[PDB]
Amino acid sequence: GMETTHYSIAQHFSSGDFPAVYACFNDIIEWNIIGNQVVKGKADVIDFCNKMLPEMKGAVLTNDNVIQNENQIVIEGKCRYFDAEGKEAFVSYCDIYRFENDTIKTITSYCI
Amino acid sequence: GMETTHYSIAQHFSSGDFPAVYACFNDIIEWNIIGNQVVKGKADVIDFCNKMLPEMKGAVLTNDNVIQNENQIVIEGKCRYFDAEGKEAFVSYCDIYRFENDTIKTITSYCI
Numbered sequence: 001g002m003e004t005t006h007y008s009i010a011q012h013f014s015s016g017d018f019p020a021v022y023a024c025f026n027d028i029i030e031w032n033i034i035g036n037q038v039v040k041g042k043a044d045v046i047d048f049c050n051k052m053l054p055e056m057k058g059a060v061l062t063n064d065n066v067i068q069n070e071n072q073i074v075i076e077g078k079c080r081y082f083d084a085e086g087k088e089a090f091v092s093y094c095d096i097y098r099f100e101n102d103t104i105k106t107i108t109s110y111c112i
Numbered sequence: 113g114m115e116t117t118h119y120s121i122a123q124h125f126s127s128g129d130f131p132a133v134y135a136c137f138n139d140i141i142e143w144n145i146i147g148n149q150v151v152k153g154k155a156d157v158i159d160f161c162n163k164m165l166p167e168m169k170g171a172v173l174t175n176d177n178v179i180q181n182e183n184q185i186v187i188e189g190k191c192r193y194f195d196a197e198g199k200e201a202f203v204s205y206c207d208i209y210r211f212e213n214d215t216i217k218t219i220t221s222y223c224i
Contacts, residue, residue, distance in 0.1 A: 034204045035224040067186055067208065072179045074186050074208070076220070092146045094206050094222045096179065096186070108188070110206045110222035112147040 006073050006099055007066070013107065014063050014075040014095045016056030018049035026103040034110045055081070073097045079111075118185050118211055119178070125219065126175050126187040126207045128168030130161035138215040146222045167193070185209045191223075 012020040025046065031039045039048045063077040075095045083089040096108040124132040137158065143151045151160045175189040187207045195201040208220040 034206075067179065067181060067184045069179060069181050074179055076208070092222070094146075094208070094220075096188070096206070108206075110204070110224055112222055112224065 002102065003068065003070070005102060006097070007068065009099075009104065010066075010073045010075050010095070010097050011063055013097070013104070014077055014093070015061045016053075016059065016079070018046075018053060018056070021104065022046050022049070024102065024104055026100055026105045029104055030106050032106065032108045034108065071099055073099070114214065115180065115182070117214060118209070119180065121211075121216065122178075122185045122187050122207070122209050123175055125209070125216070126189055126205070127173045128165075128171065128191070130158075130165060130168070133216065134158050134161070136214065136216055138212055138217045141216055142218050144218065144220045146220065183211055185211070 009021050009024050012018075025042050027042050028040070029042055029045050031045050031048070033039070039045050058081070060080040061077060062080075063075050065076040067074040074097075075093075077093055077095075079091040079093060081089055081091070092112045094110040096106075097104055098106040121133050121136050124130075137154050139154050140152070141154055141157050143157050143160070145151070151157050170193070172192040173189060174192075175187050177188040179186040186209075187205075189205055189207075191203040191205060193201055193203070204224045206222040208218075209216055210218040
């Protein structure tokens with residue numbers, strides 16, 4: 001049902017596998033990366049995700065926790081990557097999805 | 113009912129009015145301030161909140177959005193405060209509460 005589809009979409013996006021869910025983007029999707037920027041519209045969000053994709057492919061992302069209602073879903077997780085000293089580092093993230101039926105209407109990401 | 117009580121508790125904590133909800137803390141409550149620290153146990157979390165309270169009283173906190181299931185609740189908001197130049201600044205927060213019936217079991221805060 002809808003709950004399982006939302007769950008899957010969110011899991012894929014949060015873990016960096018953006019291309020698996022581009023077809024689920026609303027035409028006017030917004031991605032609000034808190035403290036950074038808001039990317040708006042299907043084409044601009046897909047292009048931004050594609051620019052970012054190699055960084056995700058080189059990193060290791062683990063989704064840790066999920067909070068789901070009928071409409072909105074929240075995923076916490078961590079992204080392991082390597083810093084300037086070429087040393088291991090971790091970004092802790094919280095991604096919040098608002099769906100409009102089976103499309104992603106908004107994504108809000110807190111990344112620390 | 114339970115949903116409205118959880119909602120109220122979370123609203124008060126997220127807006128910095130910690131003393132209104134100390135009586136709702138679980139004995140082994142944990143507050144995980146992402147990228148900072150984990151404060152553990154009722155007494156230590158209350159003491160930490162009390163140390164922080166004057167900073168909250170001098171700031172202006174606005175809860176913007178809420179995602180609630182039967183158990184866990186997520187509040188997004190912003191805290192307006194003044195920086196080193198004595199200039200206005202804003203921390204964007206996402207607070208995630210896990211309840212154990214009517215007690216707060218865990219709080220996880222992402223603050224940017």
